Design a protein around this ligand. Sequence first.
Ligand code: HEM
Ligand code: HEM
Ligand code: HEM
Ligand code: HEM
Lengths: 146, 146, 141, 141
Amino acid sequence: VQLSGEEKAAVLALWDKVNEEEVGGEALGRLLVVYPWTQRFFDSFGDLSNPGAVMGNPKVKAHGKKVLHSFGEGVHHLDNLKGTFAALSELHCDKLHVDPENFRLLGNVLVVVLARHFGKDFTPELQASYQKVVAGVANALAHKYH
Amino acid sequence: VQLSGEEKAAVLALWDKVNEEEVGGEALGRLLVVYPWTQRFFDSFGDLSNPGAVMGNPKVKAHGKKVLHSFGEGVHHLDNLKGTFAALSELHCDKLHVDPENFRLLGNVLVVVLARHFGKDFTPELQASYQKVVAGVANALAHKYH
Amino acid sequence: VLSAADKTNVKAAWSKVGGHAGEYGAEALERMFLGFPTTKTYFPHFDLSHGSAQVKAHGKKVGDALTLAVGHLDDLPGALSDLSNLHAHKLRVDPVNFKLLSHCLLSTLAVHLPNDFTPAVHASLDKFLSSVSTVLTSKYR
Amino acid sequence: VLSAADKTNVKAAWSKVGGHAGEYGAEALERMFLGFPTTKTYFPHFDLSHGSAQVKAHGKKVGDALTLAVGHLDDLPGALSDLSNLHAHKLRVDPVNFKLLSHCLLSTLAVHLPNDFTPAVHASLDKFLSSVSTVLTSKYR
Ligand code: HEM
Ligand code: HEM
Ligand code: HEM
Ligand code: HEM
């Protein structure tokens, strides 16, 4: 679950620039739109029928911020991913019954949203480092499962 | 990782009746026939063109016996899987580059083969226990992933 | 996806299944709820008890639906559209669940027809279940 | 799998890609090789070095193949038949790798067309790539 010393430096330096509100809200919104079955877990939020309603939903934006803040804990604790997500692993696996594959799907959507926000600066080398972080976060969340 | 008191008992009780020769071979054989992309890792075994050549292949039968031996060491070391498969993990992951998803497929095929040999004695409650074992083994083998 | 050989295998194999489709569908469900508890999520209003009449009644539905699909291998999207609207648009079932049921269905078939469940039939039957699954998880209208 | 709205979104999305399909294909491959080293196993006979001309040429092939598919959405199995034979029977590519390349293609599109890569476009493009992937991994001789 780790990267080169120069990888962490690059990963964290980019995070200094991430707006958790804008990125978080877009990531959760694109998850619900691209993989519709995930809407099933957020019916309490309201109308999620079309992308217009989803991206403009305040609940989606607010929750997306919370999710992104969690990835932030991950990024700042890469050596202790399992411990950082123990509580959330219990919630998502034992309480919500969310299939693990979905942890991996949200991870990639997030990377796609980072690519859209930083453009040519999100180099293939930078993405490669983030594919490790996202993989690690997903694995740690699936721990309490197995 | 964990099974109930009489879960382990019913599981081992069935394993004691498993034919070490046949089972493993049919399981690897079915994997190669149902999911043909796996044949890519066994070209040196020879002809894997049609189901007739695969099930009758000597290399496949022998190697299957080994594989079946490993699940055994898995069914007997449930509480310490990540240690019993640490070596094989480095092999399949670091050396062969086998995608984790395949570890899952073989586990499941093994379960279908077990269902075929034992019939109604392979109750839904028993299969449930074996699905835990199969999940545990797949995870341990994927653990050392890089 | 479904070649000519697969089609023949499927039609031939389902004939061996016959009127037991409903029974098998019910057993497959039971194996799924136990083996993968995460699937009980879609049946909150169900008596998932051992030997439940609700599970039996539902298994029958799943069973006839597959028999209907075997008769329309050349047009599953059209023949299964009402079930696609149900599972994809209304229930929004996670596609991973279909792989679990498929696996549990094949296990059930290996139990009751061990001599007919040959590797070749196993391969075709698996491609057949995947196609059906794709159609039920897709929102195509 | 693909609704009318999806086909519309794809055709429109590829129209913005224009003549850069090959460039994007090349970049996506570079992103895939670095992000998931496992994929390099399939290209032993390649110079996967930074800026390699082989990757560039292959990117062009992949890009044209995709433009070809966008022109035949209503019959991907037939328009991509030769490609399926190559990837499924001859190469025996693990279907998992197709998800990797598709993700790297979407990432590349997000980078170059940030204002056009909308949620709806993203969703249709994803179903599109999944459809093409299923055709290239299915052995339906
Ligand atoms: C890597 C992925 C994920 C991360 C890091 C993440 C993070 C979180 C966090 C931080 C919470 C907040 C809990 C609290 O307020 O105490 C949460 C709640 C929740 N998550 Fe996730 N999540 C992930 C994936 C998913 C997925 C894929 C689904 C389902 C498809 C999901 C469904 C939920 C639901 C329903 C809740 C409860 C929401 C509420 O009522 O506040 N999560 N998650
Ligand atoms: C739970 C799943 C699996 C278990 C328990 C397992 C176990 C083993 C064992 C015990 C060996 C013997 C190594 C030795 O003799 O030192 C082995 C070797 C190997 N395995 Fe697996 N394996 C699994 C899945 C797979 C899968 C899915 C593939 C490929 C798709 C694979 C490909 C190989 C290959 C190519 C070798 C080397 C064969 C040789 O050169 O003799 N294995 N495996
Ligand atoms: C390929 C297999 C599947 C087929 C062919 C199938 C078929 C059917 C049929 C025929 C019905 C409608 C019966 C009626 O009108 O009363 C139905 C309902 C339903 N199915 Fe499926 N199904 C399949 C997979 C799934 C999966 C994987 C799940 C999720 C675990 C699921 C969850 C449900 C639910 C919740 C209902 C409604 C149950 C109720 O409220 O009575 N189905 N399915
Ligand atoms: C859906 C996306 C894909 C498309 C449309 C695609 C397209 C192509 C095309 C058009 C060619 C042959 C071009 C020629 O004849 O010169 C090709 C060859 C090949 N593809 Fe793919 N491909 C895809 C995904 C993959 C994946 C995921 C892998 C594996 C990581 C892969 C591995 C190969 C290899 C190794 C070759 C042969 C390369 C050579 O020896 O020149 N392809 N692909």
